[PDB]
C-alpha cells in the first residue's frame, strides 16, 4: 500500500536519496542542462523549480542563503544561482525547467533517460516536439470553425 506517496525510493535510503538529488541539482545549476534516469530527473524537476523560487527571495535572505549552501555543493555556484538564474527568472512564475524523455541509454541496462534544462540557457535548442502548422487540412478546417464562430458574434 503506497497510497498518497509523492517521493520515490532512490539510493540507499532517505539520506542517500537526498545526496543524489543534491549532486544532480549541483550539476544542473553548473551546466544549465543535464541528463539522468527518467525517475531521477522527474524527482529533480521539483527541487530545481523550488531552488529558483528560493533564489528569488534575495541574496540577504538567510534561509535561502543556508538552503543554497546546503544544496549547491560547489560553492562557486551560489553566486551564480543568486545573480544569473534568479535575476533572469523574474516574470516567470513556474516555468523554470524543461524536461524531455530522450532515447534509452546505449549501455546494456537500457535505462529510461530524461534531460532537464533551465530555460533561457546559452545552449543549442533541443529538438522540441513542434505542433503542426495551421495550414494543415485539419487545422485549416478548425480555423474555418473559428472564423465562423467569430463572425457569428
Amino acid at each position: 500500500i503506497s497510497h498518497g506517496r509523492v517521493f520515490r525510493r532512490l539510493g540507499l535510503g532517505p539520506e542517500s536519496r537526498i545526496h543524489l538529488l543534491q549532486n544532480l541539482l549541483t550539476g544542473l545549476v553548473r551546466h544549465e542542462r543535464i541528463e539522468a534516469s527518467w525517475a531521477r530527473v522527474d524527482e529533480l524537476r521539483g527541487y530545481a523549480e523550488k531552488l529558483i523560487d528560493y533564489g528569488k527571495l534575495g541574496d540577504t535572505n538567510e534561509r535561502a542563503m543556508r538552503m543554497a549552501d546546503f544544496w549547491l555543493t560547489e560553492k562557486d555556484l551560489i553566486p551564480k544561482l543568486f545573480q544569473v538564474l534568479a535575476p533572469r527568472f523574474q516574470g516567470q512564475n513556474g516555468g523554470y525547467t524543461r524536461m524531455l524523455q530522450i532515447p534509452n541509454r546505449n549501455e546494456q541496462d537500457r535505462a529510461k533517460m530524461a534531460v532537464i534544462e533551465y530555460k533561457g540557457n546559452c545552449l543549442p535548442p533541443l529538438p522540441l516536439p513542434r505542433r503542426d502548422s495551421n495550414l494543415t487540412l485539419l487545422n485549416q478546417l478548425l480555423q474555418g470553425l473559428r472564423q465562423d464562430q467569430e463572425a457569428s458574434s
Binding site: 560547489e74 544569473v84 529538438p127
Partner: protein, 110 residues
Amino acid sequence: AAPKNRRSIEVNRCRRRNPQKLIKVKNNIDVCPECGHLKQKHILCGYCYEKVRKETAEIRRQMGKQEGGPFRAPTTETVVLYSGETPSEQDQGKRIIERERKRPSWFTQN
C-alpha cells in the same frame, strides 16, 4: 521442491509461445521531419539530439578552456557566437565564447 516428471515439448511450446511472452509490435514509430531518421512519437529524435549533444559538448569544452580552474564559474550571463559574428548591444557585458565553426542551421541567433 524437485520436479516430478519431465515436461514435454508440447507443454514447453504452449508455455513459451503464449502471446503474453511474445514481443509486441510498436505502433508509435514515426520518422523525424528534420533528418528523416526513425523516432518515437513521445521521444526526442536520436539523430537531432546527438547533433545537439555534440555541439553542447564542444561549447562546454571551450567555455571550460576559458576557465583555467575548477571553481571559476562566471557570475554573469554567457553568450556563444560563431565565426563571422559580432556581439550586439543586448549581448555585450556577458561572458563570450567564440567558435571557429559556422553557425548551424538549427541554432538560432535570438
